Amino acid sequence: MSLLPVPYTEAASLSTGSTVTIKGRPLACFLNEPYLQVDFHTEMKEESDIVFHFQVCFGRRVVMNSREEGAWKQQVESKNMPFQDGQEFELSISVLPDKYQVMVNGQSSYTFDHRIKPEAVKMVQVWRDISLTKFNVSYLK
Amino acid sequence: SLLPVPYTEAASLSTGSTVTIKGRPLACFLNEPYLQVDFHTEMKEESDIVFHFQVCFGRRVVMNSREEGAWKQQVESKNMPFQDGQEFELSISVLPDKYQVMVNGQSSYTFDHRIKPEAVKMVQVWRDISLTKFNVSYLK
Numbered sequence: 001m002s003l004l005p006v007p008y009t010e011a012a013s014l015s016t017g018s019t020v021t022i023k024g025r026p027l028a029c030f031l032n033e034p035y036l037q038v039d040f041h042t043e044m045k046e047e048s049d050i051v052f053h054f055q056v057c058f059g060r061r062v063v064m065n066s067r068e069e070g071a072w073k074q075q076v077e078s079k080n081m082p083f084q085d086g087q088e089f090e091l092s093i094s095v096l097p098d099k100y101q102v103m104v105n106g107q108s109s110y111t112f113d114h115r116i117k118p119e120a121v122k123m124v125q126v127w128r129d130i131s132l133t134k135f136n137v138s139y140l141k
Numbered sequence: 142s143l144l145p146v147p148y149t150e151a152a153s154l155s156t157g158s159t160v161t162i163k164g165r166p167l168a169c170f171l172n173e174p175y176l177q178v179d180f181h182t183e184m185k186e187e188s189d190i191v192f193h194f195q196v197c198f199g200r201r202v203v204m205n206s207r208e209e210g211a212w213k214q215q216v217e218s219k220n221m222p223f224q225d226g227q228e229f230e231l232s233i234s235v236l237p238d239k240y241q242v243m244v245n246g247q248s249s250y251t252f253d254h255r256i257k258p259e260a261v262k263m264v265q266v267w268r269d270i271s272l273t274k275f276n277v278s279y280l281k
C-alpha cells in the first residue's frame with residue numbers, strides 16, 4: 001500500500017525457480033523519458049559487480065548488460081515497450097536454467113542468457129525515476 | 142530536512158535572477174546517477190522547456206530546449222566539478238544573453254538564451270538526487 005524508499009536495496013538469494021516481483025509507477029510522463037533500473041549485485045555494495053542489469057528508458061528502449069571486474073560488457077538492446085504511459089506496472093524477473101525471463105504486466109517481454117551463475121547474486125537494487133509499492137523475492141519447485 | 146523529488150516550483154525569472162539548488166546524488170559515480178533541472182513555460186511537465194540542464198554524474202552535462210514537444214540542438218560539456226558521494230550547490234544565474242551555471246562556487250557551464258527567461262513559469266528538479274534546498278532569488 002505505502003511507498004517504499006527509492007533507491008530500494010534488498011539482500012537476495014537466487015537460483016533456478018526464483019522470481020523477483022516489483023510493482024511501481026514512473027515518476028514522469030513518457031515525453032520526459034523517465035528511467036527504471038534493476039541491478040542484481042554480487043555483493044552488499046553498490047560498486048560491486050552486476051550479474052544482471054535491466055534498464056528501461058520509458059517509451060524508448062530497454063538495455064540489458066552485466067558489469068564484470070568493474071567494466072560493462074556486451075549490451076543487449078530491446079525496442080519492445082509493453083509499459084504504458086502514466087500507469088502502474090508489474091515487473092517480474094524469473095530465473096530459468098539458462099536465462100532470466102522478464103515479464104511486464106503478465107506478458108513475457110525480455111530474455112537475457114546467464115553470463116554468471118544466478119547463485120552469485122547477494123543483493124537487488126531498484127532505482128531511477130519510479131515510485132515503488134512492492135518488492136518480493138519468491139521461490140518455486 | 143529533505144524536499145520531495147521530483148520537486149516542482151512556480152518561478153518568475155529575469156536578468157539578475159538566480160536559482161540555487163543544494164542536493165546530493167543518490168548513487169556513487171560508478172553507477173552514473175542523473176540530475177535534471179528544467180525551466181518550463183507552463184505548470185505542466187509536458188510543456189515546453191526554455192532551459193534543460195542534465196548531469197550524468199562523472200560523465201557529462203547536456204543542455205538543450207524543447208519547443209512544440211521536440212528537442213532542439215544539444216550543447217554538451219565534459220566539465221565535471223561535482224564530487225563523488227558529496228553534497229553540491231548548483232547556482233543558475235540569468236544574464237542578459239545567457240544562463241551562467243556555478244557548481245560549488247566554480248563557474249562551470251553557460252547556455253545562450255533561445256527564448257526570453259520571462260517565458261519561464263515553473264522549475265522542475267528531478268532524477269537521482271536528494272534535495273535539501275531550492276531557492277529563487279533576485280538582485281539587479
